[PDB]
Amino acid sequence: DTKEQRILRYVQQNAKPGDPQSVLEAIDTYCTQKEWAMNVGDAKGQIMDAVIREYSPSLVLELGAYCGYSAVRMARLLQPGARLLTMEMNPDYAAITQQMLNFAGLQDKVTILNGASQDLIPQLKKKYDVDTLDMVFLDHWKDRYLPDTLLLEKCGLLRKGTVLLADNVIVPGTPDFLAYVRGSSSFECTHYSSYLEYMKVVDGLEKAIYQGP
Numbered sequence: 001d002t003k004e005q006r007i008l009r010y011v012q013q014n015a016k017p018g019d020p021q022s023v024l025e026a027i028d029t030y031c032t033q034k035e036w037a038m039n040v041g042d043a044k045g046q047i048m049d050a051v052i053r054e055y056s057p058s059l060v061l062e063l064g065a066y067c068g069y070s071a072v073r074m075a076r077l078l079q080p081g082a083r084l085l086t087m088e089m090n091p092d093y094a095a096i097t098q099q100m101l102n103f104a105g106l107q108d109k110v111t112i113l114n115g116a117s118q119d120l121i122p123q124l125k126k127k128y129d130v131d132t133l134d135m136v137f138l139d140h141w142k143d144r145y146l147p148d149t150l151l152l153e154k155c156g157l158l159r160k161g162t163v164l165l166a167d168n169v170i171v172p173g174t175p176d177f178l179a180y181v182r183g184s185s186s187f188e189c190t191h192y193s194s195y196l197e198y199m200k201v202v203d204g205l206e207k208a209i210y211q212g213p
């Protein structure tokens with residue numbers, strides 16, 4: 001099987017069904033003791049948690065679910081009624097993510113969309129009845145952070161105060177995105193230095209708050 005399949009099994013057998021914390025802990029243990037994987041991890045995850053709690057978003061979009069670790073992290077902190085949409089183009093990973101969220105008991109708060117962001121973003125308003133997003137978590141292919149930020153704006157999905165939170169702005173890095181938001185009067189940016197998941201390597205999150213056109 002695959003590393004991602006190996007990870008979901010561990011959670012099912014080492015976490016409490018319906019207990020998101022036990023799920024996060026099982027994934028962190030597996031990835032530290034057995035096989036590394038590109039989950040956001042606990043170090044950056046704690047920063048994400050602090051951001052989510054601060055802004056209290058009603059509707060969050062995640063680009064790139066992978067195995068559902070960040071989706072579990074965020075969804076567990078959403079207020080009743082608030083929702084997460086997560087886009088994952090790899091059908092195998094989308095299915096792992098859905099099962100991870102089911103196991104955690106978070107399925108009513110999350111919609112996992114199996115498709116590519118560039119195809120799904122233009123459908124959010126008409127098909128998924130979205131007005132604007134309160135927060136966007138970017139964690140998909142690094143060269144797509146900037147194209148998708150520009151597409152979100154084109155599609156009218158950002159409002160004054162929409163929070164963009166971007167993983168991996170140091171490693172692997174997203175140089176065009178980072179230069180763009182830091183240079184744009186339409187974003188107010190903050191850098192949160194941290195560490196690459198499961199590694200003693202510096203990484204960071206960038207928060208970029210949209211200011212309008």
Ligand SMILES: CNc1ncnc2c1ncn2[C@@H]1O[C@H](/C=C/CNC(=O)c2cc(-c3ccc(F)cc3)cc(O)c2O)[C@H](F)[C@H]1O
Binds near residue numbers: 038063
């Ligand atoms: C392009 N549109 C997409 N739409 C929907 N789902 C997508 C889309 N594009 C990808 N996906 C989906 O988003 C995910 C991909 C995430 C990519 N992430 C990384 O590469 C990444 C890499 C490292 C890393 C660091 C050090 C090192 F030595 C090796 C690797 C660390 C990280 O935290 C990462 O996030 C998923 F796999 C893919 O199907």
Ligand SMILES: [Cl-]
Binds near residue numbers: 038039040065068
């Ligand atoms: Cl993740």
Ligand SMILES: [Cl-]
Binds near residue numbers: 080108
């Ligand atoms: Cl609810």
Ligand SMILES: [Cl-]
Binds near residue numbers: 041043044197198199
């Ligand atoms: Cl970590």
Ligand SMILES: [Mg+2]
Binds near residue numbers: 038040139167168
């Ligand atoms: Mg990442």
